[PDB]
Amino acid sequence: ASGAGKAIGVLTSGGDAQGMNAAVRAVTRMGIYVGAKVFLIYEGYEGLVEGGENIKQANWLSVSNIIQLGGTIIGSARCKAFTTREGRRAAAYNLVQHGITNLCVIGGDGSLTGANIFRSEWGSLLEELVAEGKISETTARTYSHLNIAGLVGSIDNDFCGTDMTIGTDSALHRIMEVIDAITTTAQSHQRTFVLEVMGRHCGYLALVSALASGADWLFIPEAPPEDGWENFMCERLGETRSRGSRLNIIIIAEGAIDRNGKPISSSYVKDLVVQRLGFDTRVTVLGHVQRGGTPSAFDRILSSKMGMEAVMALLEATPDTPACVVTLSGNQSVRLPLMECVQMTKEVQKAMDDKRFDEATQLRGGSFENNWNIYKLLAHQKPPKEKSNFSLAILNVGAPAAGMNAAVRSAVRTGISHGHTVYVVHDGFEGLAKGQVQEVGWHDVAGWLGRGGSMLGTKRTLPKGQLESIVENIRIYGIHALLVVGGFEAYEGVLQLVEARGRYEELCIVMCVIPATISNNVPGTDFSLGSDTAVNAAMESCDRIKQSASGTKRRVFIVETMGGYCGYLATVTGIAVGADAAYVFEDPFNIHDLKVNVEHMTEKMKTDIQRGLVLRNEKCHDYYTTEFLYNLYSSEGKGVFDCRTNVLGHLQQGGAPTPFDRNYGTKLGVKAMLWLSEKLREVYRKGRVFANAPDSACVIGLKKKAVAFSPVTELKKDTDFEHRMPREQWWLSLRLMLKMLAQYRISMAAYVSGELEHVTR
Amino acid sequence: ASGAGKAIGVLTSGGDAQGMNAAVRAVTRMGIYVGAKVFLIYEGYEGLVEGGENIKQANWLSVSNIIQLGGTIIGSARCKAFTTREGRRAAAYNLVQHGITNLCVIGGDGSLTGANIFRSEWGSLLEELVAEGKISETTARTYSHLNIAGLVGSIDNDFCGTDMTIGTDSALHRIMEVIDAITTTAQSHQRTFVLEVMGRHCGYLALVSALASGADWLFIPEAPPEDGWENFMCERLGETRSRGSRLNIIIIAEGAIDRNGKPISSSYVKDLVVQRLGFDTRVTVLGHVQRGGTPSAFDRILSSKMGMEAVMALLEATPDTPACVVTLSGNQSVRLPLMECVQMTKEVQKAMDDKRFDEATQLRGGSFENNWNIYKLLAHQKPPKEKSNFSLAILNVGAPAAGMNAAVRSAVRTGISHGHTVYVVHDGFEGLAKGQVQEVGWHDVAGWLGRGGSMLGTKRTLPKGQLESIVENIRIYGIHALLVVGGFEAYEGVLQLVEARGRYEELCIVMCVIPATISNNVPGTDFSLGSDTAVNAAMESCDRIKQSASGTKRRVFIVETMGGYCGYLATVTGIAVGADAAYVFEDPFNIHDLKVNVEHMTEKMKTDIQRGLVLRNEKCHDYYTTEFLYNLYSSEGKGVFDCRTNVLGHLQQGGAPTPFDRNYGTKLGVKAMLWLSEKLREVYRKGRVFANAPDSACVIGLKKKAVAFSPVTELKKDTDFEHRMPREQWWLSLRLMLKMLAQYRISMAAYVSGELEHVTR
Ligand SMILES: Nc1ncnc2c1ncn2[C@@H]1O[C@H](COP(=O)(O)OP(=O)(O)OP(=O)(O)O)[C@@H](O)[C@H]1O
Ligand SMILES: Nc1ncnc2c1ncn2[C@@H]1O[C@H](COP(=O)(O)OP(=O)(O)OP(=O)(O)O)[C@@H](O)[C@H]1O
Ligand SMILES: Nc1ncnc2c1ncn2[C@@H]1O[C@H](COP(=O)(O)OP(=O)(O)OP(=O)(O)O)[C@@H](O)[C@H]1O
Ligand SMILES: Nc1ncnc2c1ncn2[C@@H]1O[C@H](COP(=O)(O)OP(=O)(O)OP(=O)(O)O)[C@@H](O)[C@H]1O
Ligand SMILES: Nc1ncnc2c1ncn2[C@@H]1O[C@H](COP(=O)(O)OP(=O)(O)OP(=O)(O)O)[C@@H](O)[C@H]1O
Ligand SMILES: Nc1ncnc2c1ncn2[C@@H]1O[C@H](COP(=O)(O)OP(=O)(O)OP(=O)(O)O)[C@@H](O)[C@H]1O
Ligand SMILES: O=P(O)(O)OC[C@H]1O[C@](O)(COP(=O)(O)O)[C@@H](O)[C@@H]1O
Ligand SMILES: O=P(O)(O)OC[C@H]1O[C@](O)(COP(=O)(O)O)[C@@H](O)[C@@H]1O
Ligand SMILES: [Mg+2]
Ligand SMILES: [Mg+2]
């Protein structure tokens, strides 16, 4: 099973997508964990060509304390030698000199194209190399096959076969930090903010940025503006002013073009707006800022997961299997052949070269086209000449979660677009019982994207107590559908209302649960809306804490995280920050395990690494509290390290939503409203809505691959109501990755890696 | 004493410098605290002109929960009507209709120029108004004098009479957050970062940004580059590359020009760099981002302080006293006449228009010229043809503090410039005993500015125990001076060496203490190096915590800050966050005070405000711990509010230094080295150095107005060694501002306001 006797090479090439260091760390540590030798190739294909000093064998400490660093400690370089066979043969020679039959390439589309051409010629290159006399025929029959596992490290997301790439999320963090500097201020005078992103080839960053910020206008190369857009844009900004909206946002990609090949410059759009509107227009150009900063939490977890799965795929790969790219489509890990992804990239580039240009956007991926349609729909209120007698109420139930407001905004716009009479109830089930129902318009949710918490009030009170009041208010207001955006209390309350359909006719209405909670404890989803924000705030506090020892004092920090009994937040935060241990309820531990971990920490702390970090979920143990672990570690570490404690309380809670959470809540809010409208038409009968089947009350998912609708009655089997969490949680396999990255010898036979899948046309 | 029967108008005009909301809040609450009526004039001089709906009377809650908001809730507008007498008469009319004889103007240079011309014509405008028949002669003899207290709210810092303006620090926060995105990554390949700041008229932001980031080159309009700078810059970048420095930073102001009037564009410098060097050059233009984001901690405190002092100056102002600008020169509040400051601004503008252009930079202020010289000195190693037999060792003692590295970097460069042999010892006095002395060069401190903590080790151990080893190592290495960068332990250790001079001849060496600690507990200074960083981290945590309720539940948060017995950090943090109470050791409080505060909180919590925040210093009370206050507030608040607790541990410690701390530590490190060189030349006699007088061992200050050098022996009188803090601390008067902003009726007769001072030529 173990990959002993074989060597793995890891290199980074292209633009240094932040989170590359997390991928390199996971690749290295998994490679020497399974017994293989790991060789770090510095400067990418450059050091591959020159070789020699640029190829060094890695130990465990070579990738120590890099997960929080952006860029790449390996370094990346553009080399033209790898383009030509003269340098590529030298690269093959230097790999053979170290017995590196396994190569992991972390880079963009050009990097992976070079890796594909390098595999395709590996046999021919070895033949020409032995022919020229630099390697004997023996020692060339071995190493006859080169194994390539690709990782898409780039901010462009231009690699067509893959949905999400390393560094896209963090580039979005940089972009939205800049936009939030503008929008969160008390907007005082009429001004126009024109943001220029570096999406020269791919406009994905421009698109998701526009969606996350609610941009008034978007210039992306995939969909250039129609002729006469000059007037159409200026009029849009004009009515925006007439509304009283004091700030317009124009997101212009670097590759912005018109229907011809002529590019549209940010300076042109600036001067255009200034001339016709007179708004204070200034162009913000991020430039290198997009590649800068720390990697986001998402980038660290996903880079670590994909680096591990890259190594595992690199060991189970026989001479026959092709070069693969380890990526995630949705939440599911998958391997795609490198050749097909390169071919699709070439097809989209040719299409974008005025061949099938209007039909190139679909080949970019369904996510791009769907994102652009959602953006345009939510941007400007088109007239819904369609009307329906249906009306729906949007609830916010439970704790506040970052991204509830984004979901409510999208739900409101999409429902108004379908002609539904959208209501918002303040304080959730409390207000629904109290009749705090308020008919909502398009502009009443204006600017709700970036606001954290909940603009509607949240209450945890379940509907069972005031059920007579809830059904009375549903009857009075004629509510035909009920959109409940919230945590476990939201799911449980919808479950109670569904179970009470047996008693109350008025509760035979379509219900939908959007899981939105910090704990990620809602059954029927992988990511509760706002768990990403909490993880990001948690790691940032942990990174601050770990940085406070200042490279000299040997100190361990016991950091207590929230999440109730659900350990998701603690474990992922531990992966993101390189925590030594993340104690959680789902992995019960006794004093024997504590002594094992403490002795492990002491041994680690005698080496070069001086800042330890253990996370504790707030409800992981009845007796081994944070104070208990503090006393244990400080006593046993006496004469080696000091111990400190930090209970991250509501620091993990009140933040603005991360860009992932905004886009996520935006999209599933749209999808929830689409599903609501479809179910309401499917269920309207004899002059009224009568929704009584269990499939008419679902939790909107994202369960493995795509968005799902799990009926609450079906989820009740797999729900631990006492602990308010699901019985089977997808993320328990990530404990093994945490423990492996912390030098815990754990037999991870229970970890399942994504299998090969062909590209979806 | 109280200002009853009189009305104050507050308006904001010009670019919405963040921290305006803090100043407006303090102006309003001080105005209605002292009994005066406060009127909020919306859109600035615009609403002054039109009046009517744009002038609304303020209550205490009208400016509630705005201190953390950037921009201005009042709103600012550019109006040309106030330029002309037609609109200025209407403005005088609208002020007379409300009996507003008192006007506070928060704005830039143009705002304060308009306020000056409005005062100068106030009598003539009233005469013409009564002549035209819109006000009777009676009701015009009253209001015959208009009182103006100006506040400089702008990112430009173009107002010459003032040293620091509201929003400068926060604009610098935005700039440096963008630069830290670039510098904190693993620099993978050679790239050039060209940052464009909006300093169209003033290049102060460009300059301080360059100093804080260690920019390789700076284009500022105050000192345009000499002819042929094209080659000189490209060579500088060339040797920067040859060093192995992989990142070059070019800060170009928007108003960048050459010796002639031709502007230098960021695009021009880009294409120039690309052409001659081939580095990956991208231009970052911040644009509106500089005005964005939250105001920094410094901006919130200083805005509140100057807003309060503006109101007080507006009430103690008779018909004869002139229009004033409330500003701080150094740490001291001061009032400067509006006419002289406007006149100086006009003189500098005429000078910059090719009149006295080479001598316009000095009229900008001594701080600008000094900052530019320090920047150029530290930027590029010029050849020090001078040499001296003197040699000095730089220590880091105590806890790590953000900005120690900036101080050590400047000290090393400045010492090398004067020909001194600079040593750095790791682990402070422990290393000095252990002989961990390493001679250091120019490039050994490269990139130390933005790194928090301490590159050199820090230890708290005082030198008395191992004094024999210290004197032995001083003799071996020939250490003629000692620069100790650290907290109270640094000062105490230097005091011990000074007192031990009588026993050991070798300890008769010039010593200097740079106060560097989180607590700001070092006697001899007002701001310890890195206290600002801790305050900023603490408020960011407190702001996040206060946002965690998200307007639904009403909750009080007990946040515990660090600082030992020194309460500075708690109190300033409470001011910045609008904390209801900041419990500190220096203001002893009993259970009676706690009941008063809790009842006050309960009464407030029944009003519109829903999020309470009371800070507690970690060592304020022996028995009334954080758990005690949690129990008290949660019990007494039963049925009104819930209580929660968050002990900010090392979250206030490990952060990277704020731009203030970098510039501060940079400058005082230079000044400490200048003072060291002067003292060592004054003490060198008989062929050897013999420093026996008390003046040879001083703590570098910044004590009231400018930098001072207090001998440690003289400061021993005003030192509480048991509690490790000074006995008389300047900041105890800020408690009264905190309490007043929190609705506590406290007789602040002990607060001293800056008196009138003429401009310093
Ligand atoms: N068709 C190719 N054949 C061989 N090598 C290639 C090919 N394309 C790119 N490379 C190599 O990969 C390196 C980097 O590729 P590229 O310039 O496209 O950046 P990237 O991976 O796409 O990252 P990013 O999109 O963010 O800029 C190139 O310097 C080149 O050496
Ligand atoms: N927020 C926006 N950003 C960028 N382009 C936009 C936006 N809204 C509309 N457009 C562009 O303006 C063009 C016409 O707009 P409009 O929606 O009014 O007519 P349409 O027939 O419905 O176009 P379509 O349905 O294909 O998007 C579209 O091609 C679209 O690309
Ligand atoms: N983080 C925030 N907190 C509080 N208020 C905010 C925040 N961001 C924006 N706003 C407010 O929302 C208001 C509505 O205008 P906004 O620019 O935000 O959205 P919009 O462009 O007008 O419409 P849409 O949301 O569909 O894009 C703004 O005036 C602003 O005061
Ligand atoms: N010399 C002046 N006389 C009369 N009014 C003036 C004068 N200068 C400025 N004002 C008034 O103050 C307003 C603001 O001026 P301006 O647009 O030039 O920015 P600013 O005053 O310099 O502030 P900021 O530093 O933020 O940029 C103007 O609209 C004008 O009404
Ligand atoms: N880091 C820098 N950024 C921008 N301009 C610089 C920098 N260093 C030097 N210069 C400019 O280059 C010119 C000459 O530089 P240099 O310091 O080497 O000679 P100098 O005679 O000593 O000038 P200076 O009066 O500043 O000491 C000066 O006009 C100076 O303004
Ligand atoms: N916040 C930081 N943390 C850790 N390392 C850093 C940080 N900033 C810079 N560095 C590292 O310090 C190294 C020194 O090079 P750097 O370009 O940053 O400074 P420099 O311009 O060459 O010197 P100078 O301060 O005089 O301007 C960089 O290669 C970088 O890796
Ligand atoms: O119950 P949820 O849905 O998991 O809400 C998450 C929040 O609730 C908590 O239990 C704590 O909430 P409270 O501070 O209000 O008591 C934490 O898990 C987290 O801060
Ligand atoms: O000793 P100083 O100079 O006051 O340093 C301040 C820091 O030291 C502290 O006492 C905490 O130190 P420790 O973490 O080692 O216990 C806090 O007051 C603060 O974080
Ligand atoms: Mg690419
Ligand atoms: Mg101005």
Side-chain angles (χ1 to χ4, degrees), chain B residues 215-218 224-226 232 236 259 372 375-376 379 382:
Chain B
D216 304 80
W217 201 265
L218 181 57
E226 295 291 339
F232 202 104
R236 280 283 182 79
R259 295 308 225 188
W372 190 51
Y375 164 72
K376 290 190 291 177
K382 266 170 163 284

Side-chain angles (χ1 to χ4, degrees), chain B residues 62-329:
Chain B
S62 64
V63 293
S64 180
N65 199 52
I66 70 172
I67 186 163
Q68 81 298 335
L69 295 183
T72 174
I73 60 139
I74 306 302
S76 166
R78 267 63 179 242
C79 80
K80 303 178 288 296
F82 207 75
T83 311
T84 177
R85 293 178 65 86
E86 183 62 26
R88 193 181 295 108
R89 183 182 320 112
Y93 175 80
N94 299 338
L95 290 173
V96 173
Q97 292 297 109
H98 287 93
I100 294 158
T101 187
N102 293 296
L103 204 79
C104 187
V105 174
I106 307 148
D109 61 306
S111 287
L112 296 178
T113 304
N116 195 41
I117 300 147
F118 183 52
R119 179 178 175 90
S120 71
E121 297 178 353
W122 172 257
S124 65
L125 290 165
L126 283 175
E127 177 275 350
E128 187 174 2
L129 201 152
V130 64
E132 205 271 319
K134 297 293 180 183
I135 207 76
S136 184
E137 186 274 334
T138 184
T139 70
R141 290 287 176 86
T142 179
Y143 318 133
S144 58
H145 55 277
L146 174 59
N147 277 276
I148 305 299
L151 287 178
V152 189
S154 62
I155 66 159
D156 308 65
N157 199 1
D158 194 12
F159 213 60
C160 295
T162 72
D163 280 22
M164 184 63 170
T165 69
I166 298 154
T168 308
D169 190 60
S170 299
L172 205 57
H173 273 64
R174 300 298 87 77
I175 295 155
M176 295 301 292
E177 283 158 17
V178 145
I179 297 167
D180 291 339
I182 313 307
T183 60
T184 64
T185 61
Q187 299 170 16
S188 70
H189 64 275
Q190 199 73 33
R191 60 182 182 162
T192 302
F193 178 72
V194 179
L195 190 54
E196 191 192 311
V197 295
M198 296 187 295
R200 170 152 294 284
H201 304 295
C202 187
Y204 181 84
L205 272 177
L207 175 53
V208 291
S209 304
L211 193 70
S213 58
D216 304 80
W217 201 265
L218 181 57
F219 305 96
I220 46 169
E222 283 78 344
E226 295 291 339
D227 190 3
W229 62 267
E230 185 182 358
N231 305 309
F232 202 104
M233 188 193 79
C234 87
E235 293 293 330
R236 280 283 182 79
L237 281 37
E239 307 114 16
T240 319
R241 181 206 75 87
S242 78
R243 195 71 217 180
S245 187
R246 239 179 289 198
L247 176 66
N248 322 125
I249 294 165
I250 321 295
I251 318 292
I252 188 167
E254 265 197 315
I257 57 174
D258 50 38
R259 295 308 225 188
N260 295 318
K262 183 62 66 66
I264 307 172
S265 66
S266 64
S267 62
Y268 177 90
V269 167
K270 173 186 167 60
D271 302 348
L272 189 162
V273 171
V274 174
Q275 189 271 324
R276 292 191 177 181
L277 292 296
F279 307 150
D280 176 27
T281 323
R282 325 191 69 73
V283 171
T284 295
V285 188
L286 291 142
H288 285 141
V289 178
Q290 300 180 227
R291 294 192 175 92
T294 58
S296 69
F298 181 101
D299 272 332
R300 294 182 203 191
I301 309 309
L302 277 294
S303 296
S304 297
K305 186 178 176 65
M306 294 189 269
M308 189 180 57
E309 280 157 9
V311 168
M312 295 197 298
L314 214 54
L315 303 193
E316 68 187 358
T318 55
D320 71 325
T321 191
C324 73
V325 191
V326 182
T327 53
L328 281 78
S329 69

Side-chain angles (χ1 to χ4, degrees), chain A residues 476-549:
Chain A
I476 288 162
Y477 286 95
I479 307 305
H480 300 115
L482 200 82
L483 190 54
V484 196
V485 189
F488 190 93
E489 316 309 339
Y491 157 78
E492 200 180 15
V494 166
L495 192 64
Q496 287 178 357
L497 296 186
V498 172
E499 288 178 350
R501 287 179 171 163
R503 179 53 151 66
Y504 298 98
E505 185 218 316
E506 302 96 315
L507 298 178
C508 298
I509 56 173
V510 181
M511 295 168 195
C512 197
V513 171
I514 288 161
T517 185
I518 295 291
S519 316
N520 198 21
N521 66 338
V522 183
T525 192
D526 288 2
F527 302 111
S528 75
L529 190 59
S531 74
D532 183 83
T533 310
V535 182
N536 276 288
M539 73 167 189
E540 277 157 20
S541 298
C542 283
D543 291 339
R544 183 70 68 76
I545 289 159
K546 199 177 195 186
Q547 286 283 22
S548 68

Side-chain angles (χ1 to χ4, degrees), chain B residues 407-521:
Chain B
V408 177
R409 194 201 78 146
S410 296
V412 168
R413 273 74 183 284
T414 308
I416 287 158
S417 176
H418 290 320
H420 304 313
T421 301
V422 183
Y423 302 88
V424 296
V425 305
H426 308 264
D427 310 312
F429 291 127
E430 284 205 346
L432 196 63
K434 298 168 116 78
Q436 301 169 237
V437 192
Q438 186 195 328
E439 185 176 359
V440 76
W442 187 281
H443 309 96
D444 299 326
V445 295
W448 283 29
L449 269 166
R451 302 181 204 197
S454 191
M455 298 299 286
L456 311 182
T458 53
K459 297 288 182 175
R460 295 180 174 281
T461 76
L462 290 171
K464 185 172 72 65
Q466 307 95 302
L467 193 52
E468 295 284 33
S469 311
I470 289 163
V471 298
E472 184 62 26
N473 281 112
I474 288 160
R475 195 210 326 291
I476 286 178
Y477 290 99
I479 306 304
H480 299 290
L482 207 70
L483 185 58
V484 195
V485 184
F488 189 92
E489 316 309 340
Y491 155 80
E492 195 178 17
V494 167
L495 189 65
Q496 285 180 357
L497 300 190
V498 173
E499 293 173 353
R501 282 184 173 161
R503 181 64 185 84
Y504 305 87
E505 184 188 60
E506 310 99 317
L507 296 182
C508 282
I509 52 163
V510 179
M511 287 176 278
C512 195
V513 168
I514 285 167
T517 185
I518 295 291
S519 315
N520 198 18
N521 68 336

Side-chain angles (χ1 to χ4, degrees), chain A residues 14-16 18 21 43 69-73 75-78 174 177-182 184-189 191-194 198 200 246-247 254 280-294 400 427 452-459 537 540-542 544-545 547-553 555 557 644-656, chain B residues 14-16 18 21 43 69-73 75-78 174 177-182 184-189 191-194 198 200 246-247 254 280-294 400 427 452-459 537 540-542 544-545 547-553 555 557 644-656:
Chain A
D16 57 351
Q18 66 282 65
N21 283 315
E43 296 89 52
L69 298 180
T72 174
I73 64 104
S76 169
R78 268 65 182 234
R174 300 299 88 78
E177 279 156 21
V178 149
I179 297 169
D180 290 338
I182 314 308
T184 63
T185 54
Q187 298 167 22
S188 68
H189 67 275
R191 58 179 179 168
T192 302
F193 173 76
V194 179
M198 296 187 296
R200 171 153 294 284
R246 236 183 290 201
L247 176 66
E254 262 196 318
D280 175 28
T281 322
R282 324 194 69 73
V283 170
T284 300
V285 188
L286 286 156
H288 284 140
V289 175
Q290 299 180 226
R291 294 190 175 89
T294 55
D427 312 317
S454 189
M455 281 295 298
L456 313 180
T458 58
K459 300 292 185 83
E540 277 157 20
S541 298
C542 283
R544 183 70 68 76
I545 289 159
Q547 286 283 22
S548 68
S550 304
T552 53
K553 188 156 192 159
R555 180 164 283 170
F557 292 99
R644 286 290 177 280
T645 301
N646 213 314
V647 180
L648 312 172
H650 300 75
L651 289 168
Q652 301 147 111
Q653 180 51 291
Chain B
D16 58 335
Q18 65 279 70
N21 282 314
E43 294 82 55
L69 295 183
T72 174
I73 60 139
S76 166
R78 267 63 179 242
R174 300 298 87 77
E177 283 158 17
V178 145
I179 297 167
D180 291 339
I182 313 307
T184 64
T185 61
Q187 299 170 16
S188 70
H189 64 275
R191 60 182 182 162
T192 302
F193 178 72
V194 179
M198 296 187 295
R200 170 152 294 284
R246 239 179 289 198
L247 176 66
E254 265 197 315
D280 176 27
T281 323
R282 325 191 69 73
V283 171
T284 295
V285 188
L286 291 142
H288 285 141
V289 178
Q290 300 180 227
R291 294 192 175 92
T294 58
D427 310 312
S454 191
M455 298 299 286
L456 311 182
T458 53
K459 297 288 182 175
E540 279 157 16
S541 295
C542 284
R544 181 69 68 76
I545 290 159
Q547 288 294 85
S548 66
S550 70
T552 303
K553 197 177 189 73
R555 175 171 281 169
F557 292 97
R644 287 291 176 279
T645 285
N646 199 319
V647 179
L648 309 180
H650 299 76
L651 292 167
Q652 305 145 111
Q653 178 52 293

